[PDB]
Protein backbone atom coordinates (compact mmCIF):
# COMPACT_ATOMS: atom_id res chain seq x y z
CA UNK A 1 0.00 0.00 0.00
CA UNK A 2 0.83 3.73 -0.04
CA UNK A 3 1.16 5.57 3.24
CA UNK A 4 2.02 9.20 3.76
CA UNK A 5 3.48 9.45 7.26
CA UNK A 6 4.10 13.01 8.41
CA UNK A 7 3.80 12.21 12.13
CA UNK A 8 5.41 14.95 14.28
CA UNK A 9 6.01 17.16 11.21
CA UNK A 10 6.21 20.64 12.75
CA UNK A 11 5.39 22.43 9.46
CA UNK A 12 2.89 21.07 6.92
CA UNK A 13 3.63 23.22 3.88
CA UNK A 14 1.32 23.93 0.90
CA UNK A 15 3.88 22.00 -1.15
CA UNK A 16 3.29 19.02 1.14
CA UNK A 17 -0.50 19.32 0.74
CA UNK A 18 -0.09 19.43 -3.01
CA UNK A 19 2.20 16.36 -2.93
CA UNK A 20 -0.34 14.41 -0.88
CA UNK A 21 -3.01 15.03 -3.55
CA UNK A 22 -0.61 14.02 -6.37
CA UNK A 23 -0.06 10.63 -4.70
CA UNK A 24 -3.67 9.90 -3.59
CA UNK A 25 -2.53 7.61 -0.72
CA UNK A 26 -4.42 4.71 0.85
CA UNK A 27 -3.27 5.91 4.30
CA UNK A 28 -2.44 9.31 5.71
CA UNK A 29 -0.84 9.99 9.12
CA UNK A 30 -0.77 13.58 10.39
CA UNK A 31 -0.49 12.66 14.07
CA UNK A 32 1.07 15.27 16.37
CA UNK A 33 1.07 17.99 13.71
CA UNK A 34 -0.53 21.42 13.65
CA UNK A 35 -2.69 20.54 10.63
CA UNK A 36 -5.56 23.07 10.57
CA UNK A 37 -9.25 22.41 9.93
CA UNK A 38 -8.86 24.40 6.71
CA UNK A 39 -6.00 22.18 5.49
CA UNK A 40 -7.66 18.87 6.44
CA UNK A 41 -10.94 19.99 4.79
CA UNK A 42 -8.95 20.83 1.70
CA UNK A 43 -7.41 17.36 1.75
CA UNK A 44 -10.48 15.20 2.33
CA UNK A 45 -12.29 17.02 -0.50
CA UNK A 46 -9.57 15.83 -2.88
CA UNK A 47 -8.80 12.35 -1.48
CA UNK A 48 -11.76 10.23 -2.63
CA UNK A 49 -9.61 7.09 -2.35
CA UNK A 50 -8.45 7.69 1.25
CA UNK A 51 -9.07 4.68 3.56
CA UNK A 52 -6.88 5.11 6.67
CA UNK A 53 -6.52 8.37 8.53
CA UNK A 54 -4.38 8.91 11.64
CA UNK A 55 -4.84 12.17 13.61
CA UNK A 56 -3.58 11.19 17.08
CA UNK A 57 -2.91 14.30 19.16
CA UNK A 58 -4.30 16.78 16.59
CA UNK A 59 -6.67 19.58 17.65
CA UNK A 60 -10.34 18.62 17.80
CA UNK A 61 -10.95 21.75 15.71
CA UNK A 62 -8.77 20.22 12.98
CA UNK A 63 -10.45 16.83 13.40
CA UNK A 64 -13.90 18.44 13.16
CA UNK A 65 -13.19 18.78 9.43
CA UNK A 66 -14.42 15.17 9.20
CA UNK A 67 -17.89 16.29 10.34
CA UNK A 68 -18.89 16.67 6.72
CA UNK A 69 -20.46 14.84 3.78
CA UNK A 70 -16.95 15.31 2.32
CA UNK A 71 -15.52 12.72 4.71
CA UNK A 72 -14.83 9.54 2.66
CA UNK A 73 -16.11 6.18 3.92
CA UNK A 74 -12.95 5.48 5.95
CA UNK A 75 -11.80 1.98 6.85
CA UNK A 76 -9.53 3.17 9.69
CA UNK A 77 -9.66 6.20 11.96
CA UNK A 78 -7.24 7.07 14.75
CA UNK A 79 -8.04 10.05 17.04
CA UNK A 80 -6.18 9.02 20.19
CA UNK A 81 -5.32 11.83 22.63
CA UNK A 82 -7.30 14.48 20.76
CA UNK A 83 -7.90 17.17 23.38
CA UNK A 84 -11.51 18.38 23.55
CA UNK A 85 -12.81 15.28 21.73
CA UNK A 86 -15.48 14.18 24.20
CA UNK A 87 -18.98 12.66 23.97
CA UNK A 88 -20.51 15.75 22.32
CA UNK A 89 -17.79 15.81 19.65
CA UNK A 90 -18.06 12.04 19.09
CA UNK A 91 -21.74 12.66 18.32
CA UNK A 92 -20.89 15.29 15.69
CA UNK A 93 -18.23 12.99 14.32
CA UNK A 94 -20.31 9.78 14.12
CA UNK A 95 -23.79 11.11 13.34
CA UNK A 96 -24.92 11.61 9.68
CA UNK A 97 -23.40 14.87 8.29
CA UNK A 98 -25.65 17.95 8.14
CA UNK A 99 -23.86 19.69 5.24
CA UNK A 100 -25.49 17.44 2.61
CA UNK A 101 -25.46 19.04 -0.85
CA UNK A 102 -28.87 19.06 -2.65
CA UNK A 103 -27.30 16.53 -5.03
CA UNK A 104 -26.56 13.95 -2.31
CA UNK A 105 -28.82 11.31 -0.75
CA UNK A 106 -26.40 9.80 1.80
CA UNK A 107 -27.96 10.28 5.26
CA UNK A 108 -25.95 7.77 7.28
CA UNK A 109 -22.63 8.05 9.11
CA UNK A 110 -19.59 8.55 6.89
CA UNK A 111 -17.78 6.26 9.39
CA UNK A 112 -20.13 3.28 8.91
CA UNK A 113 -17.48 1.34 7.00
CA UNK A 114 -14.97 1.71 9.86
CA UNK A 115 -13.13 -1.54 10.57
CA UNK A 116 -10.47 -0.14 12.93
CA UNK A 117 -11.08 2.67 15.43
CA UNK A 118 -8.51 4.04 17.90
CA UNK A 119 -9.82 6.15 20.79
CA UNK A 120 -7.09 5.72 23.44
CA UNK A 121 -6.81 8.57 25.94
CA UNK A 122 -10.13 10.20 24.97
CA UNK A 123 -12.45 11.52 27.67
CA UNK A 124 -15.53 9.59 26.50
CA UNK A 125 -18.25 7.49 28.14
CA UNK A 126 -20.85 4.82 27.34
CA UNK A 127 -22.77 7.52 25.42
CA UNK A 128 -20.02 7.47 22.79
CA UNK A 129 -19.98 3.65 22.79
CA UNK A 130 -23.72 3.52 22.11
CA UNK A 131 -23.08 5.71 19.03
CA UNK A 132 -20.32 3.37 17.85
CA UNK A 133 -22.62 0.36 18.32
CA UNK A 134 -25.41 2.14 16.41
CA UNK A 135 -23.30 3.41 13.50
CA UNK A 136 -20.39 0.99 12.94
CA UNK A 137 -21.54 -2.49 11.80
CA UNK A 138 -18.12 -3.57 10.53
CA UNK A 139 -16.07 -2.57 13.60
CA UNK A 140 -13.41 -5.23 14.08
CA UNK A 141 -10.52 -3.59 15.99
CA UNK A 142 -11.19 -1.17 18.83
CA UNK A 143 -8.66 0.63 21.05
CA UNK A 144 -9.94 2.05 24.33
CA UNK A 145 -6.67 1.99 26.30
CA UNK A 146 -6.12 4.65 28.96
CA UNK A 147 -9.84 5.56 28.80
CA UNK A 148 -10.97 6.22 32.37
CA UNK A 149 -14.74 5.95 31.90
CA UNK A 150 -14.47 2.49 30.32
CA UNK A 151 -16.12 0.03 32.72
CA UNK A 152 -17.30 -3.58 32.77
CA UNK A 153 -20.73 -2.16 31.86
CA UNK A 154 -19.12 -0.67 28.73
CA UNK A 155 -18.08 -4.18 27.67
CA UNK A 156 -21.59 -5.37 28.49
CA UNK A 157 -23.02 -2.90 25.94
CA UNK A 158 -20.51 -3.74 23.19
CA UNK A 159 -21.11 -7.49 23.56
CA UNK A 160 -24.85 -7.32 24.21
CA UNK A 161 -27.31 -9.62 22.48
CA UNK A 162 -28.70 -7.65 19.54
CA UNK A 163 -25.51 -5.72 18.70
CA UNK A 164 -23.38 -5.91 15.57
CA UNK A 165 -20.26 -5.46 17.72
CA UNK A 166 -20.90 -8.75 19.50
CA UNK A 167 -20.05 -10.59 16.27
CA UNK A 168 -17.97 -8.02 14.37
CA UNK A 169 -15.35 -7.40 17.11
CA UNK A 170 -12.13 -9.41 16.76
CA UNK A 171 -9.52 -7.30 18.62
CA UNK A 172 -9.97 -5.05 21.59
CA UNK A 173 -7.42 -3.11 23.58
CA UNK A 174 -8.30 -2.00 27.13
CA UNK A 175 -4.78 -1.44 28.47
CA UNK A 176 -4.64 0.41 31.81
CA UNK A 177 -8.40 0.88 32.08
CA UNK A 178 -8.95 1.15 35.84
CA UNK A 179 -12.66 0.46 36.02
CA UNK A 180 -12.37 -2.80 34.08
CA UNK A 181 -12.35 -6.02 36.17
CA UNK A 182 -12.23 -9.81 35.67
CA UNK A 183 -16.01 -9.89 34.99
CA UNK A 184 -15.46 -8.21 31.60
CA UNK A 185 -14.02 -11.60 30.54
CA UNK A 186 -17.42 -13.26 30.99
CA UNK A 187 -18.87 -10.70 28.55
CA UNK A 188 -16.11 -11.49 26.06
CA UNK A 189 -17.35 -15.10 26.05
CA UNK A 190 -20.34 -13.72 24.07
CA UNK A 191 -18.06 -12.78 21.13
CA UNK A 192 -18.08 -15.27 18.25
CA UNK A 193 -14.96 -13.91 16.53
CA UNK A 194 -12.85 -12.35 19.31
CA UNK A 195 -9.19 -13.30 18.91
CA UNK A 196 -7.34 -10.56 20.84
CA UNK A 197 -7.98 -9.03 24.26
CA UNK A 198 -5.38 -6.69 25.75
CA UNK A 199 -5.89 -6.11 29.49
CA UNK A 200 -2.24 -5.30 30.25
CA UNK A 201 -1.78 -2.90 33.19
CA UNK A 202 -5.45 -3.19 34.16
CA UNK A 203 -4.89 -3.11 37.91
CA UNK A 204 -8.22 -4.79 38.77
CA UNK A 205 -7.69 -7.61 36.26
CA UNK A 206 -5.82 -10.70 37.45
CA UNK A 207 -3.67 -13.23 35.59
CA UNK A 208 -5.89 -15.59 37.58
CA UNK A 209 -9.11 -14.56 35.80
CA UNK A 210 -7.32 -14.64 32.45
CA UNK A 211 -5.93 -18.17 32.94
CA UNK A 212 -9.51 -19.16 33.77
CA UNK A 213 -11.06 -17.61 30.64
CA UNK A 214 -8.61 -19.71 28.58
CA UNK A 215 -9.83 -22.95 30.21
CA UNK A 216 -13.54 -22.05 29.97
CA UNK A 217 -13.15 -21.13 26.28
CA UNK A 218 -10.60 -23.91 25.61
CA UNK A 219 -13.53 -26.15 24.57
CA UNK A 220 -14.28 -24.15 21.42
CA UNK A 221 -11.41 -21.73 20.83
CA UNK A 222 -7.83 -22.10 22.04
CA UNK A 223 -6.57 -18.90 23.71
CA UNK A 224 -3.24 -18.26 25.45
CA UNK A 225 -1.28 -15.59 27.34
CA UNK A 226 1.65 -14.78 25.04
CA UNK A 227 2.30 -12.43 27.94
CA UNK A 228 0.45 -11.56 31.13
CA UNK A 229 -3.12 -10.22 30.73
CA UNK A 230 -2.75 -10.30 26.91
CA UNK A 231 -5.11 -12.96 25.51
CA UNK A 232 -4.57 -14.18 21.91
CA UNK A 233 -6.02 -17.00 19.77
CA UNK A 234 -3.69 -19.79 18.55
CA UNK B 1 -19.16 47.59 2.45
CA UNK B 2 -16.60 46.93 -0.35
CA UNK B 3 -19.18 47.89 -3.01
CA UNK B 4 -19.16 51.44 -1.60
CA UNK B 5 -15.39 51.78 -1.26
CA UNK B 6 -13.61 54.28 -3.44
CA UNK B 7 -12.67 52.71 -6.76
CA UNK B 8 -9.33 52.73 -8.56
CA UNK B 9 -8.86 52.39 -12.32
CA UNK B 10 -5.93 50.19 -13.40
CA UNK B 11 -4.29 49.20 -16.66
CA UNK B 12 -2.51 45.84 -16.83
CA UNK B 13 0.20 45.10 -19.43
CA UNK B 14 2.01 41.77 -19.91
CA UNK B 15 5.80 41.81 -19.59
CA UNK B 16 7.54 39.94 -22.44
CA UNK B 17 -0.55 34.75 -23.68
CA UNK B 18 -2.07 38.15 -22.92
CA UNK B 19 -5.00 39.84 -21.15
CA UNK B 20 -7.63 41.16 -23.56
CA UNK B 21 -9.72 43.17 -21.06
CA UNK B 22 -6.70 44.93 -19.55
CA UNK B 23 -8.56 47.85 -17.90
CA UNK B 24 -9.60 46.96 -14.36
CA UNK B 25 -11.54 48.72 -11.63
CA UNK B 26 -11.55 47.72 -7.99
CA UNK B 27 -11.75 48.80 -4.37
CA UNK B 28 -8.90 50.85 -2.95
CA UNK B 29 -8.78 48.17 -0.22
CA UNK B 30 -8.13 45.35 -2.72
CA UNK B 31 -4.66 43.83 -2.26
CA UNK B 32 -2.10 42.67 -4.83
CA UNK B 33 -2.87 39.02 -3.96
CA UNK B 34 -6.58 39.56 -4.68
CA UNK B 35 -5.90 41.18 -8.05
CA UNK B 36 -3.42 38.40 -8.83
CA UNK B 37 -6.03 35.71 -8.09
CA UNK B 38 -8.82 37.24 -10.23
CA UNK B 39 -6.24 37.80 -12.93
CA UNK B 40 -5.26 34.13 -12.70
CA UNK B 41 -8.91 32.99 -12.70
CA UNK B 42 -9.58 34.82 -16.00
CA UNK B 43 -6.38 33.72 -17.75
CA UNK B 44 -6.77 30.16 -16.41
CA UNK B 45 -3.34 30.25 -14.73
CA UNK B 46 -2.04 29.01 -11.39
CA UNK B 47 -1.35 32.02 -9.05
CA UNK B 48 2.20 30.74 -8.56
CA UNK B 49 3.51 31.48 -12.07
CA UNK B 50 2.08 35.00 -12.14
CA UNK B 51 3.45 38.18 -10.58
CA UNK B 52 2.28 41.78 -10.43
CA UNK B 53 4.93 44.46 -10.93
CA UNK B 54 5.26 48.24 -11.03
CA UNK B 55 8.18 49.89 -12.79
CA UNK B 56 9.47 46.33 -13.39
CA UNK B 57 9.59 45.50 -9.66
CA UNK B 58 7.48 42.85 -7.93
CA UNK B 59 4.75 44.16 -5.63
CA UNK B 60 4.25 42.57 -2.17
CA UNK B 61 1.13 40.39 -1.82
CA UNK B 62 -0.53 42.45 0.92
CA UNK B 63 -0.07 45.93 -0.55
CA UNK B 64 -3.43 47.62 -1.19
CA UNK B 65 -4.25 49.35 -4.47
CA UNK B 66 -4.42 52.62 -2.51
CA UNK B 67 -0.89 51.95 -1.22
CA UNK B 68 0.35 51.48 -4.77
CA UNK B 69 -1.32 54.74 -5.81
CA UNK B 70 0.08 56.70 -2.84
CA UNK B 71 3.57 55.20 -3.08
CA UNK B 72 4.11 55.09 -6.84
CA UNK B 73 1.31 57.03 -8.57
CA UNK B 74 0.64 60.02 -6.31
CA UNK B 75 -1.52 62.67 -7.98
CA UNK B 76 -0.98 61.08 -11.41
CA UNK B 77 -3.83 60.86 -13.94
CA UNK B 78 -5.98 57.76 -14.02
CA UNK B 79 -5.38 54.90 -14.76
CA UNK B 80 -2.62 53.43 -12.64
CA UNK B 81 -0.42 51.24 -14.88
CA UNK B 82 0.79 47.86 -13.60
CA UNK B 83 2.39 44.86 -15.27
CA UNK B 84 2.04 41.12 -14.83
CA UNK B 85 4.38 38.26 -15.75
CA UNK B 86 4.06 34.48 -16.11
Amino acid sequence: GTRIDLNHCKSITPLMLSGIIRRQPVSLDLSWTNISKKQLSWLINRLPGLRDLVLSGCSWIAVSALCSSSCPLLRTLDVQWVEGLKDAQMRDLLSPPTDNRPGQMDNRSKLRNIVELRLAGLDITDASLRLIIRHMPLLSKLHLSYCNHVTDQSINLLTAVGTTTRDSLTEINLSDCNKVTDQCLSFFKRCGNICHIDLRYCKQVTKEGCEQFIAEMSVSVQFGQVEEKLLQKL
Amino acid sequence: YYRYDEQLNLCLERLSSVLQNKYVRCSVRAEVRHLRRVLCHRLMLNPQHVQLLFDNEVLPDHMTMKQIWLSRWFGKPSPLLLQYSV
Binding site: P14, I35, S36 | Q7, R25, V38, P77
Partner: protein, 118 residues
Amino acid sequence: NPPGPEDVFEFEFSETPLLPCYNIQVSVAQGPRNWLLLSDVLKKLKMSSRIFRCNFPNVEIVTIAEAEFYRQVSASLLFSCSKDLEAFNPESKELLDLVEFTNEIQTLLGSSVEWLHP
Protein backbone atom coordinates in the same frame (compact mmCIF):
# COMPACT_ATOMS: atom_id res chain seq x y z
CA ASN C 1 -4.26 26.92 -4.28
CA PRO C 2 -3.24 24.88 -1.13
CA PRO C 3 -3.97 26.71 2.19
CA GLY C 4 -1.20 27.20 4.77
CA PRO C 5 -0.95 26.47 8.54
CA GLU C 6 -2.38 29.85 9.61
CA ASP C 7 -5.20 30.83 7.21
CA VAL C 8 -15.91 39.75 -1.11
CA PHE C 9 -14.09 41.88 -3.74
CA GLU C 10 -15.50 42.90 -7.10
CA PHE C 11 -13.30 43.51 -10.17
CA GLU C 12 -14.49 45.13 -13.39
CA PHE C 13 -12.62 44.11 -16.57
CA SER C 14 -12.93 46.08 -19.83
CA GLU C 15 -11.21 46.10 -23.22
CA THR C 16 -11.84 49.84 -23.25
CA PRO C 17 -10.57 52.53 -20.79
CA LEU C 18 -13.01 52.81 -17.92
CA LEU C 19 -15.05 55.92 -17.16
CA PRO C 20 -14.10 57.77 -13.94
CA CYS C 21 -15.98 56.85 -10.79
CA TYR C 22 -16.90 59.36 -8.07
CA ASN C 23 -17.54 58.60 -4.40
CA ILE C 24 -20.42 60.87 -3.34
CA GLN C 25 -22.90 60.89 -0.46
CA VAL C 26 -26.12 62.30 -1.91
CA SER C 27 -28.24 61.69 1.23
CA VAL C 28 -27.17 61.10 4.84
CA ALA C 29 -29.59 58.14 4.95
CA GLN C 30 -28.02 56.38 1.97
CA GLY C 31 -24.39 57.23 2.85
CA PRO C 32 -21.49 57.33 0.32
CA ARG C 33 -21.98 55.59 -3.02
CA ASN C 34 -20.06 55.27 -6.28
CA TRP C 35 -21.31 57.11 -9.36
CA LEU C 36 -20.57 57.70 -13.04
CA LEU C 37 -21.34 60.91 -14.90
CA LEU C 38 -24.46 60.51 -17.03
CA SER C 39 -22.85 62.42 -19.90
CA ASP C 40 -19.93 59.95 -19.93
CA VAL C 41 -22.34 56.99 -19.84
CA LEU C 42 -24.37 58.29 -22.82
CA LYS C 43 -21.20 59.06 -24.79
CA LYS C 44 -20.06 55.43 -24.39
CA LEU C 45 -23.54 54.00 -25.08
CA LYS C 46 -23.96 56.27 -28.14
CA MET C 47 -27.49 57.04 -27.04
CA SER C 48 -29.61 60.03 -25.97
CA SER C 49 -30.71 60.68 -22.40
CA ARG C 50 -34.32 60.10 -23.46
CA ILE C 51 -33.66 56.61 -24.87
CA PHE C 52 -31.52 55.68 -21.87
CA ARG C 53 -34.19 56.50 -19.27
CA CYS C 54 -36.90 54.81 -21.35
CA ASN C 55 -35.08 51.57 -22.16
CA PHE C 56 -33.01 51.10 -18.97
CA PRO C 57 -35.53 52.16 -16.28
CA ASN C 58 -33.87 50.23 -13.43
CA VAL C 59 -30.74 52.41 -13.73
CA GLU C 60 -30.67 54.99 -10.95
CA ILE C 61 -29.99 58.51 -12.34
CA VAL C 62 -29.55 61.10 -9.59
CA THR C 63 -29.23 64.86 -10.15
CA ILE C 64 -27.47 67.12 -7.61
CA ALA C 65 -25.89 70.58 -7.61
CA GLU C 66 -22.61 70.59 -9.53
CA ALA C 67 -21.20 72.72 -6.70
CA GLU C 68 -21.94 69.93 -4.23
CA PHE C 69 -20.35 67.41 -6.58
CA TYR C 70 -17.20 69.55 -6.76
CA ARG C 71 -17.03 70.01 -2.98
CA GLN C 72 -17.23 66.25 -2.36
CA VAL C 73 -14.96 65.06 -5.18
CA SER C 74 -12.24 67.58 -4.25
CA ALA C 75 -12.35 66.19 -0.68
CA SER C 76 -10.95 62.93 -2.10
CA LEU C 77 -7.19 62.36 -2.01
CA LEU C 78 -7.56 60.39 -5.24
CA PHE C 79 -8.67 63.58 -7.00
CA SER C 80 -6.19 65.89 -5.21
CA CYS C 81 -4.11 66.94 -8.24
CA SER C 82 -6.74 65.96 -10.76
CA LYS C 83 -7.08 67.85 -14.05
CA ASP C 84 -10.44 66.06 -14.06
CA LEU C 85 -11.92 68.40 -11.44
CA GLU C 86 -10.70 71.26 -13.65
CA ALA C 87 -13.56 70.25 -15.98
CA PHE C 88 -16.10 71.35 -13.30
CA ASN C 89 -16.81 74.73 -11.71
CA PRO C 90 -16.91 74.86 -7.84
CA GLU C 91 -19.17 77.95 -7.98
CA SER C 92 -21.49 76.37 -10.58
CA LYS C 93 -25.15 77.36 -10.44
CA GLU C 94 -26.03 74.19 -12.35
CA LEU C 95 -27.39 70.67 -11.86
CA LEU C 96 -25.23 67.61 -12.57
CA ASP C 97 -26.48 64.13 -13.47
CA LEU C 98 -25.04 61.00 -11.88
CA VAL C 99 -25.61 57.33 -12.62
CA GLU C 100 -25.25 54.89 -9.74
CA PHE C 101 -22.30 52.51 -10.11
CA THR C 102 -23.85 49.00 -10.09
CA ASN C 103 -23.20 45.61 -11.73
CA GLU C 104 -26.08 46.48 -14.05
CA ILE C 105 -24.30 49.58 -15.42
CA GLN C 106 -20.97 47.78 -15.67
CA THR C 107 -22.67 45.11 -17.77
CA LEU C 108 -24.54 47.69 -19.86
CA LEU C 109 -21.18 49.36 -20.64
CA GLY C 110 -19.83 46.07 -21.96
CA SER C 111 -17.49 45.11 -19.10
CA SER C 112 -17.10 41.70 -17.48
CA VAL C 113 -17.42 41.60 -13.68
CA GLU C 114 -15.26 39.12 -11.75
CA TRP C 115 -15.83 38.12 -8.09
CA LEU C 116 -13.30 36.83 -5.56
CA HIS C 117 -14.20 34.39 -2.77
CA PRO C 118 -11.53 33.20 -0.24
